[PDB]
């Protein structure tokens, strides 16, 4: 007989749930480093490889140009995601980048302006410490599903967007949404 609270509130993802060779492999590379070098940079890269595909948000190439404006040469933008090119950005800077995958549009743009296209096992040779590296991440809440999350709509004021097929008048715009029809939220 002991008085403890036996339940687990928090699980955490330890190893990746992918059944790839390569994602499981270079997880163990940065898991090995994160233990042994004892460093905050490699501990993050280890954990980013664990996490599901939804949280690894695709960091676009115009955001990459904004981050590196200021930062001097021999400075890699390390990034545990996919890189996708912007149409609207016009002239890309010459920039050194490391990510899991590029889109084939984006790889053309970076190479054509004298850039670099580095893998994670390539980066483990170059910079074990991560000296003059720069970790970046896409924002978690940019997903469309994320806008449905929150206080239930109709709480005054949720700002949460009700789950609806068809928009316009006629579909969910009357008794509740406006003060003419009884009440506004």
């Amino acid at each position: 007989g002991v008085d403890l609270d036996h339940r687990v509130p928090r699980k955490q993802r330890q190893e990746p749930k992918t059944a790839d060779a390569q994602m499981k492999m270079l997880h163990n590379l940065y898991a090995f480093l994160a233990r042994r070098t004892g460093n905050d940079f490699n501990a993050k890269i280890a954990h980013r490889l664990c996490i599901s595909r939804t949280n690894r948000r695709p960091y676009s190439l115009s955001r990459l140009a904004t981050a590196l404006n200021g930062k001097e040469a021999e400075t890699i933008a390390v990034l545990v995601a996919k890189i996708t090119n912007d149409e609207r950005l016009l002239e890309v800077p010459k920039m050194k980048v490391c990510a899991l995958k590029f889109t084939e549009t984006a790889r053309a743009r970076i190479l054509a302006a004298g850039g670099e296209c580095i893998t994670f096992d390539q980066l483990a040779q170059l910079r074990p410490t991560g000296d003059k590296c720069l970790l970046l991440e896409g924002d978690r809440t940019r997903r469309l599903v994320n806008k449905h999350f929150g206080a239930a709509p109709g709480d005054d004021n949720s700002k949460t967007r009700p789950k609806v097929a068809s928009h316009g008048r006629k579909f969910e715009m009357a008794r509740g949404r406006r003060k003419s029809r009884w009440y506004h939220a």
């Binding site: 709509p153 609806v164 006629k170 009357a174 008794r175 509740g176 949404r177 406006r178 939220a185």
Partner: peptide
């Protein structure tokens, strides 16, 4: 709670 404004006519 979930779909406020469902009832009624507008427009």
């Amino acid at each position: 709670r979930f779909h406020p404004g469902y009832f009624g006519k507008v427009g």
